[PDB]
Design a protein around this ligand. Sequence first.
Ligand SMILES: O=c1[nH]c(=O)c2nc[nH]c2[nH]1
Length: 167
Amino acid sequence: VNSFSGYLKLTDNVYIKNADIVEEAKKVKPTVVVNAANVYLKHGGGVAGALNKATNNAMQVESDDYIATNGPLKVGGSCVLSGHNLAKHCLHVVGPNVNKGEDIQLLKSAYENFNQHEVLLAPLLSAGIFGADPIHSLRVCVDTVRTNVYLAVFDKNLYDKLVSSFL
Ligand SMILES: O=c1[nH]c(=O)c2nc[nH]c2[nH]1
């Protein structure tokens, strides 16, 4: 048993809810919250801007030190950092950004990072301002992630479309 509430079960391991990933993290304090990161860990907008704002910029301060030491992530890659006030850990995952020309085939590699964690609270990778089709992102999630993933879809209208169209 875990503390996630009000999710619709899609598969053996994937759950979905119309919820802000921020408010959900604050309520649940999951072991792992996923950030929709970029390779620079510059948390300006979308999931990254909202999560970072909720940490009072501490996420950005930690991230800048990580990049200064390690250099940029790979598209499709990840790193584990603090979850600050939101979670034990934040898994910063870089899905391809279609609005920058990145290979959508990298979305499967991005979701493979989730398999290193038994349970996660996550957004749909490469959705929103990353420009991918969220229906596609949910299909890759279901077909790639084998650990237990709780998906927080911000947009009520999109949530209903994702559920209604789910195969
Ligand atoms: O503020 C937010 N922005 C988002 O893009 C998002 N996705 C899930 N939950 C979210 N909250």
